[PDB]
Design a binder for this molecule. Structure first.
Ligand SMILES: CCCCCCCCCCCCCCCCCC(=O)OC[C@H](CO[C@@H]1O[C@H](CO[C@H]2O[C@H](CO)[C@H](O)[C@H](O)[C@H]2O)[C@H](O)[C@H](O)[C@H]1O)OC(=O)CCCCCCCCCCCCCCCCC
Ligand code: CLA
Ligand code: CLA
Ligand code: CLA
Ligand code: CLA
Ligand SMILES: CCCCCCCCCCCCCCCCCC(=O)OC[C@H](CO[C@@H]1O[C@H](CO)[C@H](O)[C@H](O)[C@H]1O)OC(=O)CCCCCCCCCCCCCCCCC
Ligand SMILES: CCCCCCCCCCCCCCCCCC(=O)OC[C@H](CO[C@@H]1O[C@H](CO)[C@H](O)[C@H](O)[C@H]1O)OC(=O)CCCCCCCCCCCCCCCCC
Ligand SMILES: CCCCCCCCCCCCCCCC(=O)OC[C@H](CO[C@@H]1O[C@H](CS(=O)(=O)O)[C@@H](O)[C@H](O)[C@H]1O)OC(=O)CCCCCCCCCCCCCCC
Ligand SMILES: CCCCCCCCCCCCCCCC(=O)OC[C@H](CO[C@@H]1O[C@H](CS(=O)(=O)O)[C@@H](O)[C@H](O)[C@H]1O)OC(=O)CCCCCCCCCCCCCCC
Ligand SMILES: CCCCCCCCCCCCCCCC(=O)OC[C@H](CO[C@@H]1O[C@H](CS(=O)(=O)O)[C@@H](O)[C@H](O)[C@H]1O)OC(=O)CCCCCCCCCCCCCCC
Ligand SMILES: CC1=C(/C=C/C(C)=C/C=C/C(C)=C/C=C/C=C(C)/C=C/C=C(C)/C=C/C2=C(C)CCCC2(C)C)C(C)(C)CCC1
Ligand SMILES: [Cl-]
Lengths: 338, 35, 30, 31, 48, 46, 30, 65, 163, 30, 483, 31, 30, 30
């Protein structure tokens, strides 16, 4: 009885369901769906004072499922919750679709990692892809959940749209000085090195191929069934040893490195965001904020970044958070003497 | 029994009849005939 | 089995230590 | 420069306490 | 192309007429092109 | 943009023309691989 | 003394780079 | 090891092995797990309601939120 | 340089830079993905108390992993006609994705060198009377203007910072 | 009514509706 | 066991050595607790709990020690404030010395268990392979945890045979230690209710005693034994790491949000008490109650306690420090020497002006003075060439009520321009940055540092949980799949 | 106490620079 | 032949280092 | 900080003394 359903879900179809597909397909379909519902139809006028739908007039770059109203706090904003009282429209005007999307997305991400584990167990391979997927989930939980929980409200989370993310990026520089954050520097290093490794390994394989065909199109020199290497690891090791000084000699270590580099970068950036939830910032170097203030001649690129951050902060915040009602007169706004 | 608690219990009692066992009583029917 | 650390792992470990220390030195000094 | 004093001694134990560990592990592997 | 002859039309026209009749603006509370400045950020939680 | 793509395309055809005339533009010969017939680069190896 | 730490650590990266090129473990074919 | 230490070197050796003696013994079939499933849904309901109650989604008289 | 460039050119709204971001983040995705797949379907050669990297011998001719098993896993993960069966095509894609996208983002820097900046959507959504409804691009402008009026402070004697 | 008929329609019965709505939005005078 | 990252698996099949290496982690943990508290007390300033509490001084372990019952030292003093002569036996030192002695004893016991690994407890009677019965051991352990929970919450927190726990008023001025009756109703789920904590521990002690008794006499089902890899101790590690990272997130959240367990006399205020102006509204409400009690403005404003005014410093928000601004809070703004009094800014037209306080987000903030209407009336300019507003152009005067400047009025542009900077940081205070060589840049409290570290701990223990769950399930294919 | 500042760092490198050497030599002997 | 250092030599070396350092610490501090 | 060095070094002598008695290399008869 109970075994029949297990045998059902483990079947070979066009899309594998599995047991994880109960916690993945009902959530992901909602989260993805609530984005398309949001970015087509609902406004951010009552949460943000901005327009963020195709119905407003926005395009794909400037639509978002923006974060909830700043007065909603860290409320879950359930549809039946007190802030909507079951009323659908009042739930969409206060940014309840952001919480719908974010919660269904984190459950979809859990369901997808469970799916990766389940399919590895069914087929019988190691679960390294789920381990590698723990880095996007660490980043998702840091950016969309841990950061707004550490802040005032869900409002300061990232909106589910392109330009909302661009605002989030510039907000993080101006208010957080996030480029100066070393955990983010390791994140950048990990991601850039992951892209370097991807490119260099693909081109190295493609240029150390064996003559396993007769045509000039070398893409037909490989069969799925063959048990032999399609590219010379010896020639590749020789080339990179005499170009770069070092080379891989172990194929398994190479492909573990290709796993390890972007995953650990992405995890280190998640650590940096976890720090920015509590405002624990690598904002400044105390020695240089001191020296530049005892010496009106000491200019470094860092001091010019601190000035740029103040310029961003004062010239964004009056329309970034409109619940705060920041009033800055034109003559306290830091200008650079236009 | 504040309204914000009545809706909480009602969401329990409704979503049990939305995804918990509309889907399970359908999984039984669809697992008996795709054995 | 006894523990190993081959030469390549030693060089990799030395660089990751040395570069990570160079990165975090500026912030330990503040 | 108003820098952290212990920032020197934090920098050098951060980078040679692991380093000697690696050399210990390497040397005992090589012998 | 037989059972979907009108099925694809009926659905597409349904979405078109959902926008065109103005039901979308009332469906999601979206401000119409002249409800923006007759600006109201909601300032309270339990009663928006 | 045109100068950059055409410098890339020139590098492509320069490498490919050299390799096709040489006789190794379709891959490494499995029968004889040039690195296998080269002396080691490591100074300790004799 | 803050520049001294930076220069010493940079010398450690340079020494590791030299020793990992010059005195590297030879890759033997099988 | 096949030889254990003397009882003078470890007095509580055999008195505490009786507890570590049926390692691997199970009950056949699904066991008492049907009650375990009821508790896995009840404790998840408890965690959900206590989170909603902390969060102020559930405002019952008694919680200042 | 990044901040001043955003202030003066709005690179975030430049499509070549969106391609560059897709390239670097997707190259990291594909690097982690390809590495986890080759690592996950390794042929058993070693014991559990020794590194799996000892299963490969430098110059061994035999394939050290199972393309079939990694392929079957990836295909079950998304759909059937998605997983590369072929490996030569697979590594051409690994080469091509971040290389082509970094080509495009280098080209984006280069056309912004001639002041052909990114997309501009300021004052683009108007209400019935004509009032500008702010969008998210407007908020990005407002932050870029923040950066814009603070860079090279004692060096713009006229209000128009040209190139 | 099968599994094939639901995993190709729950994604596409809404999608055509959305596309029809968005095509109507290209003709809205605001 | 041969790769460096696998070496501790040499005790994975050796439960006597496993107990040894656990007792050594215990010795290190307790020795760290003892030595850290000794270092926290060598650096502690107990002279005043009003302006130099432990949360301003970077005290990490001291709040946790004093939250249960140990508030007074053998030196006489107490973190509540009173000096006496007979501070019981359980002082701040006795606790650290007890942990140091425990650490020494545990080091010796770990030495014994490393040497005498081959005892017939860890090998079953029928064969001689090393095994530990995880369901039985789990039941015994769950029962032990149940008695300890039940007892701690029903005898140490109630105070029946225990010191009690720290309770406080909402304003956080009357912080003391007393035994708390349990709260079984809905009121027990109030986060700022200590009877809820007491009732939680009682109820969960009964629950864990019953579950431990059920996990000692009932063997696991044959499907769940192989399903959850119950013979694999690694699987136990994975589930424990799950409990460990989700507790870390809950602990970090309840430290950042503030519960009855983290009161503000020990960990200081939260950032959310500054965000909503909690102490600001409290003081305004108290002041106006005194004003309507026939008292003068200066007389009402001088009954505000210095401890109640100090909570309105944004320098005491835990969301205002930095990642690498290391150390204690008084390493930043400095040592507070006194409350300057409530500043009341008045324009040249005789209008009540209020300086916009700065939020937690801003490293620096434009000083802009509003009025009852909320229109800008003065500010500290930047462009100063079309600046229609401004202190000296409008002639803004600051007059203080309460504190050290009670009755004093300032009208100099320099002085008003300075006190309008200190007014946006909350209640103005005088800071001596010479005692601690304070650099002037704000630092987070022990509340902020604990929350941030235990969030990092939650994240890495999430990964460690995943790593060991995947290793426990996929044990058969770790070396590789199949030829 | 007017003691040499570097007398701390002289004391600890005098006594652990040789010490790690010995441990290196011991560990590689034991393995 | 490779270098050795047996356990007894390690203990002797550690004590001679540690006691000599304790002796000369008082004079390095001065 | 001068007493700290002395106490740390004395702890190092005490640790060496313990480990050279407790965990000493066994003297085997030939
Ligand atoms: C790794 C992968 C892990 C697996 C992913 C699992 C996904 C689960 C998703 C849970 C998200 C919960 C958010 C609920 C809102 C919230 O929490 O809501 C926060 C509320 C507290 O509310 C805040 O309380 C403060 C006190 C002030 O009043 C603030 O204004 C008010 O917003 O607490 C609460 O509900 C109680 C919660 C306290 C614990 C929060 C820990 C987060 C650490 C943040 C630092
Ligand atoms: C895990 C649960 C728990 C914890 C963390 C504590 C913690 C504490 N209790 Mg306690 N207690 C508990 C359960 C607990 N109790 C239960 C179930 C009861 C009922 C019997 C009591 C009854 C009790 C009394 C009567 C007293 C305490 C006291 C204390 C404090 C001093 C004891 C100490 O730390 O020495 C730590 C010990 C070690 C580190 C071990 C080293 C010892 C070896 C032999 C050396 C301390 C913070 C004392 C107090 O009030 O503090 C001022 C006190 O008088 N408790
Ligand atoms: C009637 C008796 C009684 C009373 C009055 C209480 C009262 C209380 N219990 Mg409880 N309890 C009882 C009986 C009782 N209990 C019994 C019989 C059991 C056995 C099941 C329990 C088991 C239990 C647990 C496991 C917990 C409580 C907790 C609590 C406190 C909740 C308030 C709080 O701080 O929120 C805190 C926690 C929550 C509101 C739930 C958080 C769960 C999160 C949302 C899960 C998801 C987070 C994820 C893992 C990490 C996030 C990652 C990223 C996305 C942020 C409260 C005072 C909680 C507590 O003590 O917190 C410190 C708690 O965790 N109790
Ligand atoms: C899951 C059961 C559970 C939960 C939710 C708690 C929760 C709590 N305990 Mg605790 N405790 C427990 C079991 C539990 N305990 C058991 C079995 C013992 C026996 C040793 C104790 C002994 C103990 C002591 C001595 C103290 C606490 C204290 C606390 C509070 C501070 C720690 C914290 O906030 O993070 C929450 C802890 C977690 C594990 C969160 C994770 C929950 C699941 C795994 C997710 C907190 C609300 C401190 C307190 O403030 O009491 C007055 C305190 O001093 N506990
Ligand atoms: C209760 C916690 C716990 C325990 C008992 C273990 C136990 C184990 N882990 Mg593990 N792990 C954990 C948490 C834990 N882990 C967490 C939280 C993570 C994510 C950060 C990991 C990620 C992880 C990986 C990737 C691996 C293991 C492995 C192992 C096994 C080999 C032991 C080893 O690595 O030694 C070797 C370690 C060293 C020789 C030096 C490491 C030095 C560290 C980096 C610095 C030490 C910091 C400090 C001194 C420790 C204090 C921590 C503090 C925050 C509390 C072992 C059974 C390995 C395995 O699977 O076995 C085959 C393996 O590859 N773990
Ligand atoms: C060994 C490697 C260590 C690497 C980490 C070091 C952390 C930064 C060191 C910066 C520093 O100068 O510390 C020295 C400071 C001393 O305190 C600081 O001293 C400085 C030196 O003059 C300045 O005077 C500062 O103003 C003062 O606050 O101590 C710390 O704050 C270190 C706290 C570390 C806590 C880590 C918790 C880990 C949790 C797990
Ligand atoms: C590593 C181990 C080193 C052990 C030897 C250290 C020598 C004594 C160190 C004392 C000291 O404080 O040095 C520090 C002094 C620095 O100079 C001194 O600094 C002190 C610190 O504040 C005081 O200020 C003194 O007044 C000042 O003279 O440098 C030396 O004099 C060391 C000279 C060593 C020359 C050795 C030559 C060996 C020849 C072969
Ligand atoms: C407005 C533009 C519209 C017109 C201009 C063309 C634009 C479309 C793209 C290119 C058009 C020509 C096709 C060339 C592809 C090809 O066959 O070579 C690719 C070879 C062909 O192999 C071979 O491929 C054969 C067919 S197929 O490729 O498998 O379909 C197969 O039979 C054979 O066995 C195999 O070896 O291998 C592949 O199939 C790999 C495909 C991956 C390449 C695309 C990667 C893009 C990512 C980065 C780019 C960023 C985007 C900005
Ligand atoms: C600048 C200060 C900062 C220093 C930074 C540098 C860090 C280096 C860390 C250690 C890296 C080397 C590990 C071992 C490599 C190897 O085995 O090489 C072995 C080679 C021989 O090559 C080999 O020889 C082997 C046979 S044999 O050695 O010739 O017998 C053969 O097997 C092998 O294939 C062949 O390659 O030679 C050596 O013996 C190297 C050991 C030297 C010790 C490390 C250098 C110490 C610093 C020197 C400068 C002093 C600085 C003074 C100022 C403070
Ligand atoms: C207090 C801080 C200052 C520390 C001062 C102490 C310095 C010690 C230096 C190293 C001396 C020991 C060398 C090796 C001895 C030996 O092999 O023992 C082997 C023995 C087993 O005995 C043995 O066991 C062997 C077999 S086996 O090990 O059991 O497998 C067997 O062959 C042998 O006959 C038997 O005797 O056990 C060990 O593994 C000892 C290694 C522990 C590492 C050194 C201690 C590290 C400090 C611990 C406290 C941390 C301090 C934290 C605060 C900073
Ligand atoms: C012998 C003996 C004794 C004694 C004892 C003692 C005296 C002790 C002690 C102890 C101690 C004194 C301890 C301790 C500890 C500590 C610890 C254990 C710690 C730590 C740490 C850590 C872990 C950290 C790490 C790190 C850092 C450094 C920072 C950050 C990063 C990292 C993480 C890396 C007696 C007589 C009693 C008895 C008999 C025996
Ligand atoms: Cl600039």
């Amino acid at each position: 009885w109970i075994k029949q359903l297990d045998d059902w879900l483990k079947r070979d179809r066009f899309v594998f369901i599995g047991w994880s597909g109960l916690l993945l397909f009902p959530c992901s379909f909602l989260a993805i769906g609530a984005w398309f519902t949001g970015t087509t139809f609902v406004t951010s006028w009552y949460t943000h004072g901005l327009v963020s739908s195709y119905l407003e007039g926005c395009n794909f770059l400037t639509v978002a499922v923006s974060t909830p109203a700043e007065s909603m706090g860290h409320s879950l904003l359930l549809l039946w919750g007190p802030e909507a009282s079951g009323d659908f429209v009042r739930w969409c005007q206060i940014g309840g679709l952001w919480t719908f999307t974010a919660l269904h997305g984190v459950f979809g991400l859990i369901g997808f990692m469970l799916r990766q584990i389940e399919i590895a167990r069914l087929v019988g391979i190691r679960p390294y892809n789920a381990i590698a997927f723990s880095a996007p989930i660490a980043v998702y939980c840091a950016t969309f959940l841990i950061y707004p929980l550490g802040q005032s409200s869900w409002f300061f989370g990232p909106g589910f749209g392109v330009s909302a993310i661009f605002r989030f990026l510039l907000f993080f520089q101006g208010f957080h000085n996030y480029t100066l954050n070393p955990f983010h520097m390791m994140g950048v290093t990990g991601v850039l090195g992951g892209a370097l490794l991807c490119a260099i390994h693909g081109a190295t394989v493609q240029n150390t191929l064996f003559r396993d065909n007769q045509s000039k199109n070398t893409f037909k020199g490989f069969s799925t069934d063959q048990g032999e290497e399609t590219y010379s690891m010896v020639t590749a090791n020789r080339f990179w040893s005499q170009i770069f000084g070092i080379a891989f000699s172990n194929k398994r270590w190479l492909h573990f490195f290709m796993l390890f580099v972007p995953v650990t970068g992405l995890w280190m950036s998640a650590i940096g965001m976890a720090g920015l939830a509590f405002n624990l910032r690598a904002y400044d170097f105390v020695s240089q904020e001191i020296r530049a203030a005892e010496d009106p001649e000491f200019e470094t690129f860092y001091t010019k970044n601190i000035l740029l951050n103040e310029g961003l902060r004062a010239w964004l915040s009056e329309m970034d958070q409109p619940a705060k009602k920041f009033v800055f007169p034109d003559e306290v706004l830091p200008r650079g003497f236009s | 029994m504040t309204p914000s608690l009545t809706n909480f219990m009602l969401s329990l009692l409704a979503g049990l009849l939305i995804v918990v066992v509309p889907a399970t009583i359908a999984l039984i029917f669809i697992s008996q005939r795709d054995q | 089995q006894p523990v190993e650390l081959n030469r390549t792992s030693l060089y990799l470990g030395l660089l990751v230590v040395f570069v990570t220390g160079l990165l975090f030195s500026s912030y330990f000094f503040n | 420069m108003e820098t952290n004093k212990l920032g020197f001694v934090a920098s050098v134990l951060f980078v040679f306490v692991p380093t000697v560990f690696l050399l210990i592990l390497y040397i005992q592997t090589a012998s | 192309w037989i059972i979907h002859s009108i099925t694809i039309p009926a659905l597409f026209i349904a979405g078109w007429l959902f926008v065109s009749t103005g039901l979308a603006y009332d469906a999601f509370g979206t401000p119409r092109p002249n409800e923006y400045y007759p600006l109201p950020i909601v300032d309270d939680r339990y009663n928006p | 943009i045109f100068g950059f793509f055409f410098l890339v395309g020139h590098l492509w055809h320069a490498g490919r023309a050299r390799a096709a005339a040489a006789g190794f533009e379709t891959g490494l010969d499995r029968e004889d691989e040039p690195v296998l017939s080269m002396a080691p680069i490591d100074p300790s190896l004799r | 003394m803050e520049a001294v730490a930076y220069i010493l650590i940079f010398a450690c990266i340079i020494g590791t780079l030299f020793f990992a090129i010059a005195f590297r473990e030879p890759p033997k074919i099988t | 090891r096949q030889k254990y230490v003397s009882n003078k070197a470890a007095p509580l050796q055999y008195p505490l092995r009786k507890l570590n003696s049926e390692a691997g013994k199970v009950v056949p079939g699904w066991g008492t797990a049907p009650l375990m499933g009821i508790m896995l849904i009840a404790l998840l309901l408890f965690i959900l309601t206590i989170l909603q109650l902390y969060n102020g989604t559930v405002i019952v008289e008694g919680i200042d939120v | 340089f990044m901040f001043v460039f955003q202030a003066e050119h709005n690179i975030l709204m430049h499509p070549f830079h969106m391609l560059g971001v897709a390239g670097v983040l997707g190259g990291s995705l594909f690097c982690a993905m390809h590495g986890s797949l080759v690592t996950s379907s390794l042929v058993r050669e070693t014991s559990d108390s020794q590194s799996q990297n000892e299963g490969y011998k430098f110059g061994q001719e035999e394939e050290t992993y199972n393309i079939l098993a990694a392929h079957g896993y990836f295909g079950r993960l998304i759909f059937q006609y998605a997983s590369f069966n072929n490996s030569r095509q697979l590594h051409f894609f690994l080469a091509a994705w971040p290389v082509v996208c970094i080509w495009f983002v280098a080209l984006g820097i280069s056309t912004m060198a001639f002041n052909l900046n990114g997309f501009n959507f300021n004052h683009s959504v108007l209400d019935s009377q004509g009032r500008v409804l702010p969008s998210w691009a407007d908020v990005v402008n407002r932050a870029s203007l923040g950066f814009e009026v603070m860079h090279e402070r004692n060096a713009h004697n006229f209000p128009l910072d040209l190139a | 009514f099968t599994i094939r008929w639901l995993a190709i329609h729950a994604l596409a019965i809404p999608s055509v509706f959305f596309l029809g709505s968005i095509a109507a939005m290209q003709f809205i005078q605001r | 066991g041969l790769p460096w990252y696998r070496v501790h698996t040499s005790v994975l099949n050796d439960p006597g050595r496993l107990i040894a290496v656990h007792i050594m982690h215990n010795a290190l943990c307790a020795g760290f607790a003892g030595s850290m508290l000794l270092f926290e007390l060598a650096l502690f300033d107990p002279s005043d709990p009003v302006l130099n509490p432990m949360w301003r001084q970077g005290c990490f372990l001291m709040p946790f020690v004093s939250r249960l019952g140990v508030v007074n030292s053998w030196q006489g003093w107490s973190v509540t404030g009173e000096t006496f002569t007979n501070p019981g036996f359980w002082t701040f030192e006795t606790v650290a010395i007890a942990h140091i002695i425990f650490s020494g004893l545990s080091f010796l016991a770990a030495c014994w268990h490393w040497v005498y690994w081959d005892v017939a407890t860890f090998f079953d009677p029928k064969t001689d392979e090393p095994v530990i019965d995880l369901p039985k051991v789990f039941g015994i352990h769950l029962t032990l945890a149940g008695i300890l929970c039940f007892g701690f919450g029903a005898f140490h927190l109630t105070g029946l045979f225990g010191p009690g726990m720290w309770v406080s008023d909402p304003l956080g001025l009357t912080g003391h230690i007393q035994g708390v009756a349990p709260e079984w109703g809905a009121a027990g789920f109030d986060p700022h209710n200590p009877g809820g904590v007491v009732a939680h521990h009682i109820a969960l002690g009964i629950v864990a005693i019953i579950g431990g008794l059920f996990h000692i006499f009932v063997r696991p089902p044959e499907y769940l034994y192989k399903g959850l890899r119950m013979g694999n101790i690694e699987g136990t590690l994975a589930s424990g790491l799950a409990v460990f990272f989700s507790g870390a997130f809950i602990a970090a959240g309840t430290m950042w949000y503030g519960t009855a367990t983290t009161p503000i006399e020990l960990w200081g205020p939260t950032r959310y008490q500054w965000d909503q102006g909690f102490f600001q509204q409290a003081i305004s409400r108290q002041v106006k109650a005194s004003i309507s009690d026939g008292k003068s403005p200066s007389e009402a404003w001088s009954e505000i306690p210095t401890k109640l005014a100090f909570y309105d410093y944004i320098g005491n928000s835990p969301a205002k420090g930095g990642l690498f601004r290391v150390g204690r809070m008084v390493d930043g703004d400095g040592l507070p020497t006194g409350w300057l009094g409530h500043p009341v800014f008045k324009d040249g037209e005789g209008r009540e002006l209020t300086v916009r306080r700065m939020p937690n987000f801003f490293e620096n903030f434009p000083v802009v003075l509003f009025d009852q209407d909320g229109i800008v009336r003065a500010d500290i300019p930047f462009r100063q060439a079309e600046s229609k507003y401004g202190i000296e152009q409008t002639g803004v005067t600051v007059s203080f009520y309460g504190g050290e400047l009670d009755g004093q009025t300032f009208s100099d542009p320099k002085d008003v321009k300075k006190y309008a900077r200190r007014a946006q940081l909350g209640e103005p205070f005088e800071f001596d940055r010479s005692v601690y060589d304070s650099d002037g840049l704000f630092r987070t409290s022990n509340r902020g540092f604990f929350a941030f570290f235990h969030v990092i701990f939650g994240l890495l223990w999430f990964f460690g949980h995943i790593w060991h769950g995947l290793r426990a399930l996929f044990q058969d294919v770790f070396s590789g799949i199949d030829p």
